[PDB]
Write a protein that binds this ligand. Structure first.
Ligand SMILES: *[C@@H]1O[C@H](CO)[C@@H](O[C@@H]2O[C@H](CO)[C@@H](O[C@@H]3O[C@H](CO[C@H]4O[C@H](CO)[C@@H](O)[C@H](O)[C@@H]4O)[C@@H](O)[C@H](O[C@H]4O[C@H](CO)[C@@H](O)[C@H](O)[C@@H]4O)[C@@H]3O)[C@H](O)[C@H]2NC(C)=O)[C@H](O)[C@H]1NC(C)=O
Ligand SMILES: *[C@@H]1O[C@H](CO)[C@@H](O[C@@H]2O[C@H](CO)[C@@H](O[C@@H]3O[C@H](CO)[C@@H](O)[C@H](O)[C@@H]3O)[C@H](O)[C@H]2NC(C)=O)[C@H](O)[C@H]1NC(C)=O
Ligand SMILES: *[C@@H]1O[C@H](CO)[C@@H](O[C@@H]2O[C@H](CO)[C@@H](O)[C@H](O)[C@H]2NC(C)=O)[C@H](O)[C@H]1NC(C)=O
Ligand SMILES: *[C@@H]1O[C@H](CO)[C@@H](O)[C@H](O)[C@H]1NC(C)=O
Ligand SMILES: *[C@@H]1O[C@H](CO)[C@@H](O)[C@H](O)[C@H]1NC(C)=O
Ligand SMILES: *[C@@H]1O[C@H](CO)[C@@H](O)[C@H](O)[C@H]1NC(C)=O
Lengths: 49, 596
């Protein structure tokens, strides 16, 4: 859900580092302006198309 | 970097978790409402606690972004809603005290019961027996006593708790920047930041008063006609110039005058429009009714329901051990799931209710693309109005003839239109003064200008002034009559029922104009028309992304609510009532009192 820049065609990215958004570097810990980059789907049979 | 990018980053996270948590809480609520068990209640409590708790931290975290550095005006709306609706400012002891009082309010109202005099043998509840008695029984003593008994056994208990309740709510608004808890409600219609569309909180009071001034002649003429007809039922008790007794309105509080239709029919000899027997002859079931309702929406161009709606929604009472509430509701669980919860019988009312409920679902699907915090109507009135404009067209004889329930041999003349208009009048026109009266008094009591010792004193004084209804038994300050109302005890805003009614007739007049319809307004259909459908759909998809003044402009062309379409709808009834009131005095006298 969050990346510093775009991706070149036919490229993959697996690195998981805390995406800093605020000015202060939070040294890679969870908190304000420091979100984990990998979000999660949720799937249930009752969803709609 | 700048605040704007950081705020957008935070919003792009909040939306993701909000969707999932809302689904879990809403699904748990649906499970209990269709399956009444103790563990379902526990599931609601757990899911509700997580959703309530999650909103608390997000409200706390949103404080770090000052609102004066946002110029997009779209992020500001989301930030304002998030900060406001989950922020708590009272102390812990005061917070739990307010929660305990509110729980007491709901508990006493649900558990309240009154029964026959000097007989503790058998007793009944308000919903099963009291509603039926005031709607059907014509006994003067029974109606008067039951009206007095319920208020005595409910208002007296609720009086001191309301006095503590009004206080704590005031410091809640006082702690915030609002002047009083009354202004907190009036902030829903507030619009700021847009030139040519700004709406002030104080402007609403002036607008409401001005609108009610013009609709006075219609109400008093109807009141005079009602008084004359009711003279036949209770001659001795009713005075030709006094106010009507409060226990002879056909319901508990006189909110609706529907129950007086039989006693006040204009032409009883002529047949009434009814299709219940026609559906019985044609063997109509629940699915057929909803399919017919669905086809109506397709005929105007709106897309019809998905497969998930048909499989998941239930339309019939399960019966047996499976017990569920039969109150018609339209559920929007989010993430592409829409369901309708109601128990359906083969009646005209259920046929019309299907159209009314289906309107809410279509409105919900309209703004599915908007962000999570903006998935709502422009205000508290638009949502109700949308689901009511379509019930008007469904009941028109032309639509019934086109479907085929009504025989083509039916004809229309004086009485058919007059009877139909008067039946609508007793449901729509009558409730407007009652709603305005309750809201205005409740505004004054929260303002603090009225002392506690004059709460009941001023309450009845204005009842004989505007509503023109006099109480049948005097009451002191021990009673708390407004507390007997369901909405008052449960802390619900009541002004939405006054803005909604005036909104719906503005929409119907505009759509009928776009449909190139001619003739009387009350005979209008939009089934084949598609220009009306696309014009309506343009406003529906907006959601909360635009000020409600702009949304109103995009449909009718005005920046404020108006009363002309409502009067134009009932104009033929107004002329006939003027003819019938030639020999009847117009206006009620406040000096008369039924109890000597
Ligand atoms: C900010 O926070 C507040 C509260 O914390 C949230 O406000 C709630 O908003 C919802 C959405 O409108 C309100 O739900 C509405 O309640 C009305 C009150 O009805 C009560 O009484 C009936 C019995 O007569 C009960 O069945 C019902 O459950 C209520 O207890 C309903 O009348 C409304 O239903 C209307 O629409 C449906 C279609 O959706 C129609 O079918 C109905 O016939 C009816 O016309 C509606 O359900 C709720 O009351 C609000 N809470 C409070 C305390 O007022 C906001 O949602 C939140 N903002 C966010 C999250 O952004
Ligand atoms: C206020 O903020 C919102 C949200 O950040 C801005 O909405 C954004 O508007 C741009 C263009 O106006 C959208 O870009 C479009 O993206 C689609 C793909 O989704 C692409 O196909 C289009 O060609 C275009 O590039 C952007 O998606 C949209 N943001 C969101 C979340 O939908 C809005 O513009 C801001 N207000 C002002 C005045 O800038
Ligand atoms: C909208 O169009 C449909 C399609 O023609 C109309 O349905 C017809 O109505 C006439 C009555 O005027 C019937 O004789 C036909 O049998 C109907 N046909 C079908 C396929 O249902 C419908 O009446 C139109 N709506 C309005 C309000 O006129
Ligand atoms: C309702 O709850 C009971 C109790 O767990 C469960 O057995 C049942 O499957 C649920 N659903 C229905 C339709 O009864
Ligand atoms: C309405 O539903 C029918 C299925 O009964 C479907 O074929 C049709 O496409 C739907 N209408 C629209 C506009 O998609
Ligand atoms: C009934 O309608 C006709 C329309 O031609 C009108 O002439 C007549 O005056 C009406 N009667 C009443 C009592 O309104």
């Amino acid at each position: 859900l969050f990346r510093k820049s775009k991706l070149k065609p036919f490229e993959r990215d697996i690195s998981t580092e805390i995406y800093q958004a605020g000015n202060k570097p939070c040294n890679g810990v969870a908190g304000p302006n420091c979100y984990s980059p990998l979000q999660s789907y949720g799937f249930r049979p009752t969803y709609g198309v | 970097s700048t605040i704007e990018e950081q705020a957008k980053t935070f919003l792009d996270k909040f939306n993701h978790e909000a969707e999932d948590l809302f689904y879990q809480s809403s699904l748990a609520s649906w499970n209990y409402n269709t399956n009444i068990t103790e563990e379902n209640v526990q599931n609601m409590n757990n899911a509700g606690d997580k959703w309530s708790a999650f909103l608390k931290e997000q409200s706390t975290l949103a404080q770090m972004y000052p609102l004066q550095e946002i110029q997009n005006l779209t992020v500001k709306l989301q930030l304002q809603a998030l900060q406001q609706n989950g922020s708590s400012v009272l102390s812990e002891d005061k917070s739990k005290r307010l929660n305990t009082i509110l729980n007491t309010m709901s508990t006493i109202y649900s558990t309240g019961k009154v029964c026959n005099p000097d007989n503790p043998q058998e007793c009944l509840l308000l919903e099963p027996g009291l509603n039926e008695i005031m709607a059907n029984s014509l006994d003067y003593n029974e109606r008067l006593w039951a009206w007095e008994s319920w208020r005595s056994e409910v208002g007296k208990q609720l009086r001191p708790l309301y006095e503590e309740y009004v206080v704590l709510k005031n410091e809640m608004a006082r702690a915030n920047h609002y002047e009083d808890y009354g202004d907190y409600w009036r902030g829903d219609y507030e619009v700021n930041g847009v030139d040519g569309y700004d709406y002030s909180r104080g402007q609403l009071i002036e607008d409401v008063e001005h609108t009610f001034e013009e609709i006075k002649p219609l109400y008093e003429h109807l009141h005079a006609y009602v008084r004359a007809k009711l003279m036949n039922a209770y001659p001795s008790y009713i005075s030709p110039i006094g106010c009507l007794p409060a226990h002879l309105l056909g319901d508990m509080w006189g909110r609706f005058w529907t129950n007086l239709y039989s006693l006040t029919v204009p032409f009883g000899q002529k047949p009434n429009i009814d299709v219940t027997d026609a559906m019985v002859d044609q063997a109509w079931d629940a699915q057929r009714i909803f399919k017919e309702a669905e086809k109506f929406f397709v005929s105007v161009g709106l897309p019809n329901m998905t497969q998930g709606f048909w499989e998941n929604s239930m339309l019939t009472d399960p019966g047996n051990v499976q017990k569920a509430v039969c109150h018609p509701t339209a559920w929007d669980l989010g993430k592409g799931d829409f369901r309708i919860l109601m128990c359906t019988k083969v009646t005209m009312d259920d046929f019309l209710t299907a159209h009314h409920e289906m309107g809410h679902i279509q409105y919900d699907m309209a703004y599915a693309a908007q962000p999570f915090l903006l998935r709502n109507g422009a205000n508290e009135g638009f949502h109700e109005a949308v689901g009511e404009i379509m019930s008007l067209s469904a009941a028109t004889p032309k639509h019934l003839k086109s479907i085929g329930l009504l025989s083509p041999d039916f004809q229309e003349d004086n009485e058919t239109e007059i009877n139909f208009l008067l039946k609508q009048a007793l449901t729509i026109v009558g409730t407007l003064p009652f709603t305005y009266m309750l809201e205005k008094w409740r505004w004054m009591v929260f303002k603090g200008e009225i002392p506690k010792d004059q709460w009941m004193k001023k309450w009845w004084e204005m009842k004989r002034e505007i509503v023109g209804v006099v109480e049948p038994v005097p009451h002191d300050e021990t009673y708390c009559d407004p507390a007997s109302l369901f909405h008052v005890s449960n802390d619900y805003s009541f002004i939405r029922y006054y803005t909604r009614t005036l909104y719906q007739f503005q929409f119907q007049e505009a759509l009928c104009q776009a449909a190139k319809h001619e003739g009387p307004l009350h005979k209008c259909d939009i089934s084949n028309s598609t220009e009306a459908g696309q014009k309506l759909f343009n406003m529906l998809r907006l959601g909360k992304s635009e000020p409600w003044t702009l949304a109103l402009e995009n449909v009718v062309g005005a920046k404020n609510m108006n009363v002309r379409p409502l009067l134009n709808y009932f104009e033929p009834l107004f002329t006939w009532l003027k003819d019938q009131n030639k020999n009847s005095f117009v206006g009620w006298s406040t000096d008369w009192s039924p109890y000597a």
